[PDB]
Paper text:
Here we describe the de novo design of pH-responsive protein filaments built from subunits containing six or nine buried histidine residues that assemble into micrometre-scale, well-ordered fibres at neutral pH. We then applied the filament design method described in Shen et al. to dock these connected monomers into a wide variety of helical filament arrangements and design the amino acid residues at the newly formed interfaces to drive assembly.
The DpHF18 subunit structure and the primary (largest) interface between subunits in the filament are very similar in the cryo-EM structure and computational model. However, the second small hetero interface deviates from the design model, resulting in antiparallel dihedral symmetry (D1) in addition to the helical symmetry generated by the main interface. Even small deviations in the geometry of the designed interfaces from the fibre design model will compound as the fibre propagates and can lead to non-specific aggregation or alterations in fibre geometry, as observed for the DpHF18 design. DpHF18, DpHF19 and DpHF19_9his disassembled at pH 3.5, 3 and 4.2, respectively, and all reformed when the pH was raised from 3 back to 8. Pre-assembled DpHF18–Cy5 fibres were mixed with freshly disassembled DpHF18–Oregon488 monomers at pH 8, and growth of Oregon488-labelled fibres was observed at both tips of the Cy5-labelled seed fibres, indicating that the fibres grow from their ends. To study the dynamics of DpHF18 filament disassembly, we assembled DpHF18–Cy5 fibres and reduced the pH from 8 to 3 in a flow cell while imaging with TIRFM. We observed disassembly in less than 1 s after the pH drop. The fibre lengths dropped very fast at pH 3.1, while remaining stable at pH 3.4, demonstrating a sharp pH transition over 0.3 pH units. The sharpness of the pH dependence probably arises from the very large number of protonatable groups: each subunit contained six (DpHF18 and DpHF19) or nine (DpHF19_9his) buried histidines, and the fibres contained hundreds of subunits.
Residue numbers in the entry:
A (entry chain F), B (entry chain P), C (entry chain O), D (entry chain E), E (entry chain Q), F (entry chain R), ...: 1 to 226
Write the structure that this text describes.
Amino acid sequence: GSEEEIAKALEELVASLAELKRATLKLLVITEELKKNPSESALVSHNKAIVEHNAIIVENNRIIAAVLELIVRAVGMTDEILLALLELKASTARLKVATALLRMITEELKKNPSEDALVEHNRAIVNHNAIIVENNRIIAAVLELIVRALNLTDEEVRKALEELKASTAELKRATASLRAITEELKKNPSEDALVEHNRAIVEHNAIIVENNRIIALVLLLIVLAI
Amino acid sequence: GSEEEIAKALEELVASLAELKRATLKLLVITEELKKNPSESALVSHNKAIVEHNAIIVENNRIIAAVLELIVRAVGMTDEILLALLELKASTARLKVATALLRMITEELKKNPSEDALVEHNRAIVNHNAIIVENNRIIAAVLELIVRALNLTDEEVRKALEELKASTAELKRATASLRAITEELKKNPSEDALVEHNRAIVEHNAIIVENNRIIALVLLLIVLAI
Amino acid sequence: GSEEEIAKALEELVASLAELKRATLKLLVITEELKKNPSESALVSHNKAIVEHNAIIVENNRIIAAVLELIVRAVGMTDEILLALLELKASTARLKVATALLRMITEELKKNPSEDALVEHNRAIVNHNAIIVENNRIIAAVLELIVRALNLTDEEVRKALEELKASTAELKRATASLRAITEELKKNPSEDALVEHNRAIVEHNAIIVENNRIIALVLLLIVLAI
Amino acid sequence: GSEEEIAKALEELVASLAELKRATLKLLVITEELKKNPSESALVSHNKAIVEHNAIIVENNRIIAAVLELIVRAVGMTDEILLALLELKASTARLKVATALLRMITEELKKNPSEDALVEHNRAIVNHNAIIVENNRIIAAVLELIVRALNLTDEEVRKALEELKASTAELKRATASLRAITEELKKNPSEDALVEHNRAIVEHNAIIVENNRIIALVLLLIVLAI
Amino acid sequence: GSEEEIAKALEELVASLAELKRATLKLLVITEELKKNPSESALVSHNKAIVEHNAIIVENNRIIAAVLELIVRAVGMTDEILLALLELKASTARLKVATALLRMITEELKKNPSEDALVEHNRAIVNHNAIIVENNRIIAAVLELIVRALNLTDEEVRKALEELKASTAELKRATASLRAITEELKKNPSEDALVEHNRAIVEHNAIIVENNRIIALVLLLIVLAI
Amino acid sequence: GSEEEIAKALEELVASLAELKRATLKLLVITEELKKNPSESALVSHNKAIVEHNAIIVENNRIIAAVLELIVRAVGMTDEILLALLELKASTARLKVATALLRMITEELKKNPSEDALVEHNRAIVNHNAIIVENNRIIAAVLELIVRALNLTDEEVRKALEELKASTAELKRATASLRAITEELKKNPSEDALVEHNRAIVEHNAIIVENNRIIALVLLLIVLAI
Amino acid sequence: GSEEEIAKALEELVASLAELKRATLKLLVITEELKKNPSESALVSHNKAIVEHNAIIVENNRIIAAVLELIVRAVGMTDEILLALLELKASTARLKVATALLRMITEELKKNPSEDALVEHNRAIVNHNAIIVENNRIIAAVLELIVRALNLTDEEVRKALEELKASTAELKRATASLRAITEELKKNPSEDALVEHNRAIVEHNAIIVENNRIIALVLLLIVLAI
Amino acid sequence: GSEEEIAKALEELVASLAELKRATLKLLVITEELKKNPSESALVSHNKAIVEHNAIIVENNRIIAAVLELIVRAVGMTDEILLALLELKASTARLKVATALLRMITEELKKNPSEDALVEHNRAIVNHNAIIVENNRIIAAVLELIVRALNLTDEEVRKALEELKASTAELKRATASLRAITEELKKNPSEDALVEHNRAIVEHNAIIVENNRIIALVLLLIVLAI
């Protein structure tokens, strides 16, 4: 694309990041309210808020994939870039599918809520997040390839990539930890467990938001360096 | 006011009536869903929807009171009209107060829901409706006085006032019946009772919407007859 | 206004006239179908179609009144013109009011139809049409005044005004005849009468459409003559 | 098809489900309105609304058959899959035929309504629904075959298939019950019966909508598992 | 005042309550952010946010005192009411003074921040809150007197006063607890203590906001009962 | 005075302090601009800005003296307080006189500027400031007496008085230093000296503003302690 | 554009210049306050103020680019003008990108401040300013081309271009000097260095504001000469 | 516009004329004071006062152009009127531009005054005045056309036009004379010359104010004659 398109899309990206931050703060609020005064309708409303937060994350990842497609068409594809973009487009479609899945089981829970339904819903949130994680790893791999293909020497870019790789390994560890406590919850579901679990979900989402911030810094540095 | 103001406000009134009808249909839907699949979060969301329906009714009554003030300033006040308009302005303010009261106990229920809280909330809904009813009785008395002051001979107007008086007596009977079952619920609260009670509330609200339809026919006939 | 505004608004007027003609043809179709195979649901659907046809007429008269306001601001007001435009603006508001009245009793008939409701609805249609007629008489008087104020000597204009005065007297006669058979129906209501009456209504609407055609010829001739 | 096509079509599917839910809520509303104030024109309009709801269901089933064809072309046909898809394509054509039949007898009823015509129309609605049921049984058999062919071990998928088989047996029972009361109505047609019958139709349609929701959950789980 | 003034002022009160709730949620957010990533500039900005939250509480108490003066002029003063209103007006002025004091030492901290300055600022926040508490105790005493003076028998009012007396004793206990940990901090100041202390402050402010909610329920119930 | 008067006057005091701070910032700006690009019209305009800043300080000191008179009438006079208030009233009048003197020689400088006139004007600013200093010493002595007369044990008050005594000794030293460089300028006047001198003046005014801040903290602590 | 558009946009430009001047004065104030009383939260707030000042400069440059596009469309493009406007639009987009980059690392610093973060932030401010400088060089080249293309003989214009070229060479030298002290700071970061560095930044920003003033004089002279 | 708008705008015009007269008297005062006691800061302040006087003249000319647009829309445009109004709107925009130019070089002079800067500023005042003169010639041409288009026979109007044409030729001669002495000053700049020149400027501004008075008499006579 043209420099106007890239710049406009980065304005949309930074707008989406501000919106994502605002939503994360709100979600932390309602997480605290649920912790202090836990109840079944509080659990249902908290889960629905997590679904709307995840939908915002998915739109953020869509905008990032769009920007990357415009950037790569600017610089030119390469074998490893093209293979990573085909992996990215596949993961994007898989995410739209899991997003619809989550929204539909959310509506089932809202209509017919129960503790078993909350457990099933939390497990589906954890799977949705694991798909977001894989989306972020592929986007990070794309940015790694774009920088190595340019041979870009900016120390600010190298520093931001060291941050992005650290955040990625941290995100793998946090994902594994969340799947572990999810397998505990599935074994021993209880309201106290549902609360502790939703807390761990919100921590995982916060780490994903930090990952998306670092990703956006890498995109901004690349678009300035070309 | 001028014919443009009166006509514009009656366009706003008919718009508010269409919105009120739509909301009544929606409330009947969620009432059926609650009857078929009753649950605590369903009860909370149903009650909040009832609160938003009542807020639409209150805005309808505000627009009606505005139109009547423009109509009376068109024709001229009279002793009994002026005393009824002072009663109307008082009842309008009392309704704004009870509206805030209801919204605030609604937020308390949403935050900390329980069966006792549902009983208290249903009793407060029944008191809010009883205030709406008194607002409608005063508005009907105003229209009765306006027609008698004009000495209007239109058989369409006389017919519409016979409908309005029948609707008013019907609304008194329905209000008394709803207060009776509310006193039953307060004695013997149970989920099955909460469901039967919310059903009777929705029937009462439907009767109030019929009252507002008849009131709007009287206003339209008067504005044509002047 | 400017020549572009007047011309655009006359394009909207001729579009509304084509739509009005099309609606009149459709209404004649369903009138014939009702005559051949009369039934209660056919009566209800025919009446609702008459209400939508009347709504098209009302929009036509609104556009005509708009054009006249732009034309008079083009030429300049005069005492008799200003008094006729104040009469026109009043009649426009009265028509919007009666239009809402008709639509609301239409919804009452559709929801709770019966023969008595059909009689009352037909009488209200006849009153709505009588208000359309008064709107057209005032619009014709305005055009008569605009032409006399210009002192316009065009024989095409004089001919079109002789047509407009003949159409106006014809419309008065047809309105009186329709009120007469309406008083018959109200005295002796029957399905066969309801059918014959709806036929006479459709003839009256056809005469109103001829009136609107002549009015549009006068506006076009005036806008060319200025 | 490609992952983009499948994902797009599932977005269209979830859109169709939202539209179907909205239509089901509306249909329940008008069913209540008919129950409270039953009348011949109410019966005709209710039946026409049922026809538009069924047309939405048919479009839903078309989109499901399209998605399944793209999924099977993704995985590859097998003997039992190909035979079930030929059965599905036959049932799809049979449904388009019965849909046109229903729409045409609907137009006959609307044009020439009578109690006998209402009975005949309700019986044709019950036959149309029975064809929808057979379409759903074939779609469920196809999904059962697709999952068994993949050898998919996901416990979420097994649970969703246990839900789909339970919904299918429930839908068989409900279909039999509706044909039984239809044979009663045909024996003893009356307005009170026509109302009770239309109510049972709307309950049957609600069960079909639950079946389509579960079917969509199975498709989403399959598309994620491949 | 008049019913219009009272109703308007209660609309302003409920608006102030919504604003206060929103500010409390925001303050909980930044409290969590400070807990996770504590730092000197984070401490300064958190304290400034607490100062703006307290200023919102003070405006809430001003509006409550205004409403109470209009309510008492509606009912009439009495010896104990007049003495409590003079005590209320004194406490209102003392609060405006302490508000200015707090804002000025806040500006000193912002300009020349250090750990000692944070300790002094936290102690001054705790004194400001203790003054808010005394203002709320006097407002509760006024409402207790107004209800006893009316001799109001409404069980809803008695229930709300049992809530208000419980909230008042709870607020005394929380105030004492906060002064105790404040005396600890002054004895043993450390960044870990500053964080734990600011947490306890935010809990105390949350209890004050609950007190203001109960106070508003009492005012609304009284204004409906007169 | 009453608590309302004292509180209002302290709101006026804090407003005057905010205005004084803003003016001090502006004066530092124009001091930098004069330092960078010194010129005769810049010198004249800088001096006039210093005169308006001093007028703001004088209004601040008038408001402080008013507040102190209301506070002392609240607590009661004493021998040493009454003698200090007579000293304060004398210094207040002497300041109003020197303020008029300064404004008049300011107008002489503006009208007939020259280097000699700038020297004389700067020396008159330094004398005006020395009178402000004496006003502040008397105000501090009054507050010292009021606190000792109450026998007030608040450690916050003792701390603020240790700040006020340190600020007072600092202000004596700074005043002496400014008179010293003023005697240098008078001996060896030059534009470079005029600039360095105006810089030292602005530092002196900043120290006076710090003194007025501490004085206001003492007044606020006293008014809370009574 | 039309002369009305150009004149309006120059009113917007002069408004932006007044706002920029006011912001520059404010920034000099806080630079002095930081110099006198340096602290970590003071450093963070100073940097944030520099970011808001830079955002105002960027909006100024956007308005200048808009005006130039309207001016060139007024006079007509030429080969070198069109190539310079494409260079200008590229630099404009690059500036919007770097502006978002700076704002985001600003939020990182505000959230997680440390001395290393202040150094990194100062280096990013210096890069943002270097991009502003390149934007100004391209805008000056555009104005040089527009004047040479017009062949404008006004000695006032030639004088203003001699000022603009001198300011441009001065701005190159100042940019190089600031990058030099930035490389010193990066080698030997310390709070005393951070203060001296932020001072040099504020001097650089002041020189950019002088450049924007001269640029605006050239635009005004050109728009008068055409 | 309506007669109320025209009358209101003529009240605004006469208010602007009174303000302009008052400002002219003040400017003559400061011209005398500068003549008696000339000095650099006196020169700078005199020039700034001339800039504020010119801004008042520009607002006067804006109001005159507004009134003329309402008057011409009252009478109707004509070919020569429309071409003169397009010339007027162009000259109005050019004047807003030169007004901003003058204010900005005024701020440059105030900030960095010197004899060369005073010469350049006086020459820019003389160019600004020459643009005011062209604005007045176009306004006079418009009024000449409006009167000739009406064919107005009032001898009071003819007399006022003989005054306006004499004033216009006088204003051309005075403008030329002022440009001549401006070219002298530019050749031989000295303080004695700057004083004599500013005197001639103030005489020129007085002649422009006489022109604006005559213009206002023509507008008043026209508005009475229509």
